[PDB]
RNA sequence: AGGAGUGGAGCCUGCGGCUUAAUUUGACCAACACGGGAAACCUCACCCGGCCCGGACACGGACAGGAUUGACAGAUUGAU
């Protein structure tokens, strides 16, 4: 389905991915996700803490599974997944970046997720 | 009017006093083998050491190379 824009498509992933609990936030879980074959999607972003990890994530995509997408601004991904799920209209206690997240088999496979993502993925 | 006893002896058990780190505590005919209280631990209120949080909920803060949990071996320790 979708309108075939990369950003609002990846949002439709994220909706059902939240329910699926596919989100592997933080470096330890990110590493474990891509060292595992259960991952199917990766998105990275600009320098959060080091310019080293942005390199390392590409290094892991090389060795294990190429799937990478880059959408910059840590604050974007930080907003996109709150405490466990995106939480409130507000929420000033956190909005801190997740810096990169990995999602498992586009969350759920039930509807539009497969087509919107597959259109981009073989090209990228 | 009588019968059998208690008070004497030894022991059991409760109470006072005295001691003691602590000898937990209520009760003075209508308290005193009473608290169905014959306590090894447990009980446990007491004393002496060590550990644990099982401080809900609210508001603010922290914070995804991260809030936070637990632990092998050595030292330490009654203590693995």
**Three-class SS of residue A70?**
strand
Protein-nucleic contacts, chain A 37-96 to strand B, CB < 7 Å: 48-50, 52-53, 56, 83-84, 92-96
In this structure, what token pair is assigned to residue A103?
């999602």
Q: Yes or no: say if A75 and A95 are a contact pair by the CB < 8 Å rule.
A: yes
**Three-class SS of residue A41?**
strand
Note the resolution in Å, 1 decimal. Answer: 3.5
- CA A93 to C1' B61 (Å) is 8
CA distance A29 to A101: 9
As a dihedral over the C-alpha atoms of residue A123, residue A30, residue A54, residue A40, rounded to 10 degrees, the angle is 0
The nt closest to A94 (CA vs C1′) is B63
Mark A109-123 as b/e (b = at least 16 C-beta within 10 Å): eeeebeebbeeeeee
């Amino acid at each position: 389905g979708g309108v075939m824009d990369v950003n609002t498509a990846l949002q439709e992933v994220l909706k059902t991915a939240l329910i699926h609990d596919g989100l592997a936030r933080g470096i330890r879980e990110a590493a474990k996700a891509l060292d595992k074959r259960q991952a199917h999607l990766c998105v990275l972003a600009s320098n959060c803490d080091e310019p080293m990890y942005v390199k390392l994530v590409e290094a892991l995509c090389a060795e294990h599974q190429i799937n990478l997408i880059k959408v910059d601004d840590n604050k974007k991904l930080g907003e996109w997944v709150g405490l466990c799920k995106i939480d409130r209209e507000g929420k000033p206690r956190k909005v801190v970046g997740c810096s990169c997240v990995v999602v498992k088999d586009y969350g759920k496979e039930s509807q539009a997720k497969d087509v919107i993502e597959e259109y981009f993925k073989c090209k990228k």
